[PDB]
Every structure is written in structure tokens, then in C-alpha cells.
Design a protein around this ligand. Sequence first.
Ligand SMILES: NS(=O)(=O)c1cnc2cccnn12
Ligand SMILES: NS(=O)(=O)c1cnc2cccnn12
Ligand SMILES: NS(=O)(=O)c1cnc2cccnn12
Ligand SMILES: [Cl-]
Ligand SMILES: [Zn+2]
Ligand SMILES: [Zn+2]
Length: 581
Amino acid sequence: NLDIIGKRIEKIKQEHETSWHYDQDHPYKTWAYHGSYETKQTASSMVNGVVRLLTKPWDIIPMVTQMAMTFKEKVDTRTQEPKEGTKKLMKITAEWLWKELGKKKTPRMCTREEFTRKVRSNAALGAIFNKWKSAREAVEDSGFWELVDKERNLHLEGKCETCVYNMMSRAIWYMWLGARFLEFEALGFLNEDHWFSRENSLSGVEGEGLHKLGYILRDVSKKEGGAMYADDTAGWDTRITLEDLKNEEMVTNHMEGEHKKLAEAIFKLTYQNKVVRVQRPTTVMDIISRRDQRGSGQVVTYGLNTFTNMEAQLIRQMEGEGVFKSIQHLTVTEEIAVKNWLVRVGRERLSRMAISGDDCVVKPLDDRFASALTALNDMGKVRKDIQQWEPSRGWNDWTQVPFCSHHFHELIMKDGRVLVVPCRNQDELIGRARISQGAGWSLRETACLGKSYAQMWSLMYFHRRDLRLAANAICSAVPSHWVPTSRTATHEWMTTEDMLTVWNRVWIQENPWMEDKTPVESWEEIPYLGKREDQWCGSLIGLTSRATWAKNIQTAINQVRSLIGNEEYTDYMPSMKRFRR
Ligand SMILES: NS(=O)(=O)c1cnc2cccnn12
Ligand SMILES: NS(=O)(=O)c1cnc2cccnn12
Ligand SMILES: NS(=O)(=O)c1cnc2cccnn12
Ligand SMILES: [Cl-]
Ligand SMILES: [Zn+2]
Ligand SMILES: [Zn+2]
């Protein structure tokens, strides 16, 4: 208890001994409170004027315009401890899953060179403000790596001093760059070495890309079985138990030497015991503590979410197939039956799933899965927006299944070849592209972020009439040689390569579901959804506002070119039939 966290607490107390006080009216219930101190400050969501000026029809669509405007009483709930039968099911399953994931991989420590290369191209790692300005500065300075060195040797000594979370259905738990390095050093291999790739994990999709997720769902659909289930969990990160953290920690059983010691420390001292500083208006800073729930950096969180979700869904599959009878207790022969199931058909059962962190699609052996709820609820993974004991509603058509905020269309090219393409409501796509994050964006940086969205649209959403037209307009309106940016799925659109060449590489050449490798020699060979399907998915095609926008597009492009000024521009609009004489 306070042996593990006291050092961190004591140290913060001493840096604000002018301010410390055990406030009487603290709202914390399931979090342990410890004390308070004075600060005062927070950033918010800003509009990208380049994208907004080139999407005028959406200026009167509330779903688009309201996205730019703007429960922490879910983080302060409790989760009951699972029954002994559930704990046994999770231990056997976790044990077996780490061995499967380990068969063709070697756990290993990640390098400062790898961490530096991360900072020096802006990954979302989750640092905080006072000694150095940016991450890029602290990395390049020897004094930083000295503070790292101190903390590191405390971790090998089985102690912690500076590894503290700053809180803010989200809740990003930022740490100082230092504690982020130590997390990445110990557990970075899970992401860096693709442990949850589809090849390695069979259920996972890590690194597959939005242009492969539809093909993966269609391959699951080919399995003999029942409906496709895609039940979301209510607040997955808040439902991670101590039993889940212990089963995740068993990855250390496959490690050795310093790496093993460094990993056991991250699990024991920063994951299964945490220290958090939370801002409160009544503006003070509350040091609070907890043992359960997910508080890692967001890349390790993805990997351990995927692991624990794969485990949870194999157990729900076991329940549907009648492998065990009751969560209360597992008989000795039930243990053997569960081991024999895992070892005999476990790999086949993983291949009937697509799992991306807390998000899943399962095509089970049959529809007994739908009412197999006892283990899932008792593991605390309670389904969102359905009564606790109401059977799951499955999907009969893989093209209706939601996964990673999308659905997927089958799209026949004029030449008969078949594309499986990602899609979501077009108001969501346009609303997002109209938003920037943070202060001090130049016009140039704003234009380059617009261009990132435009190239993503050309590559992923080419089949939506409004997005191909808007993407061509943004790329005409931004100087042709300016490089797409973003301050924080493989990102093939982040390039100054010609987008038709990239389309051909992604959808034809490197596409394992495309046998005929004949290139496309124009955008006009690349199809759209049916006009009615485009409208169902949110197209404005058929509206007068949209007709005027399309007809007068060069006037909008010219308005943005006039603001940016005298630069080298390209006209991409004649790549579309209707602007080509
Ligand atoms: N609030 S909790 O879900 O972390 C929880 C469940 N059972 C216990 C027993 C002691 C402390 N906490 N606890
Ligand atoms: N400081 S470090 O994390 O780069 C490091 C130290 N020792 C090793 C061994 C393998 C990889 N990295 N590594
Ligand atoms: N992880 S849990 O919610 O199942 C749980 C059960 N019993 C305790 C005691 C302290 C913290 N968490 N906890
Ligand atoms: Cl359906
Ligand atoms: Zn630490
Ligand atoms: Zn659609």
C-alpha cells in the first residue's frame, strides 16, 4: 500500500508544503484522497479555416457545425471482484494466450534511439510542461537522461518516486516524458514488434490499415457459424480489474535479466498502484490513488486492451459452446476440458474474431454465444446500451457490422474487380476535418493539416462523391509541394507522392485480396458507391446547396489561394469527368 506509493506522495507534499491541506469536502469515493495544493489553468477545439472555406454547404448542417463547439463520475465507480471460477478461466486463458503470442516473437527492451525517433516525428506519447520546452529539447539534452537514470535505478531497486499520472468516454492520463520512456523501454516491444498483428495474434488488426479492415471482416464472414456480434463495453478502461492487471503482468514470465526487472516494476509500481493529480474548481490539485482500472500510456493501453479483450471473447465463446457450466467454481475435469479446447481449436476460435483494443467483432460457432453472459458480466465487461441479462443482437450481413467507427461496402469496379472500402456517416468525416487541436497554427500549418485530411479522403473515401470533390478542391487550393502534417492504422496519405500512384500501390499492387494487378491509369476508372447508398451514408448530392458548391468550386479554390498568396498551385479538378471540358 503506502510503502509502494508514499515516496511519490511525500515528494509532491514537499514541493507544495506551503499549500498542502487534507481538504474535508473532497468528492472522491472509490479513489483514495491524500491532499491538495494551489495552481490555476486548463486548450480547446479550433476550426480549420482552409477546410471550412472549401466545404460551404456543411456550414448549415448542425451535425457538422456542433462538432466544433464545447461523466468523470464514471472514473469514480467500483467493479466487484470476480468469482473463483471466472479467475481460473482468465488465468488458464491468459497463460495460453501469452504462449501463443510468444511462439514467433521475443520480448525485448526498446532503445533510446527508438524513443528519440518517436519524439522527432510527433507520436501521441502524452508528456507535460517545468525544465525543458518540448520533448524534442529534453531528448537532445544529457540532464534529462540523468533524471531518467535516477528513476530507472529506483525501479530495479523495486521503488518509484516520479511516475505520477495527470488526469484530464475518454481520460488521457499524461506522465512526464521520463516515466513515458521507462514504460516504452519495458513494454514498447508489444507495439514496436507487432505482437497484435493479424499474422501473429490471429484476432488482432494492429498495423493492418483502414483499407484492410473490410477485407478482414469479409474473411471472418466466410467462416461457418452464427451471426456477427459487435458488443461495445461500457467504459472498458474503468472496468479493468486487479485480476486483469495480474493476467497482463504474466508477459514478464517470458522475459529475463534487466528487461524482466524493468517490466515487473512498471506493472507492480505504476499499473497495479497509481498516483494521479486531478484539477478541481472548488482551482486546487488533488493527489488521489487507486490499484485497479487502466492507467498506462495510450500505445501500451491499446496492446493490453487487445490482449484482455481477446481473452474475454475466447471465454464468452467457451461459455456458448458449453465448455464449462458455472462461473462459481471450475471442477478439475472442467479445467482440463478448457485447456484441451484452447490447445485443440483455440487458434481457429481466435481467427473468428477482429479485435482492436476494447473494440471487437466475433463470429462464434453458433448463436448460443448471444445469451452466454455470465462470465462476461462477472469479468466486469458489462455491454453498453442493453440490459445486463438481455441476449446480444447479432448482425446477419458483414457490410452492416460496425468496427473501429466504420462499416464496409463491397464496390465493383467497371472492369469487374472487387474493392472492400471503409465508410462512415459523411457528417462525421467533414466535421472532424474542420477541427484543429492547439495554439499557434500558422496559415501554412493549417493548410498542411487540411491537405492531410484531403489525401486521406482520396485514398480511403474516394467512393463518396462529396469527399472526392472536396479532396480535389483542398489539394488544388494548397500549394502542390507543401507537405501534409498532423501533430499526433498505417498513414499512406502522409506523402507528397501523386495520390493516383499511392491509390494503385494500396488498392491493387500490395492488396492481397486483388489477384489481377493491372494498374488504374485515371481517377475515372475508380468507382463511387451507388448514388442512393452515398445519400444513405450522408451525401448532399441532389441538394441545390451542393449543386452550386460543385458548379462554382474554382471560385472557392481561388478564395483560399488568394489568402495563402502567390505560391505554385496545381488544378486537380479535371481529374473528375464533370470538370474535364
Ligand atoms: N472499489 S473496488 O472495486 O476497488 C473494490 C472491490 N472490493 C474491494 C475491497 C476493498 C477495496 N476496494 N474494493
Ligand atoms: N537505454 S536503452 O533502453 O537504450 C538500452 C539499454 N540496454 C539495452 C539493451 C537492449 C536495448 N536497449 N537497451
Ligand atoms: N480490481 S477490483 O475492482 O476487482 C478489486 C477487488 N478488490 C479490490 C481491492 C482494491 C482494489 N481493487 N479491487
Ligand atoms: Cl444485419
Ligand atoms: Zn517510477
Ligand atoms: Zn457507408
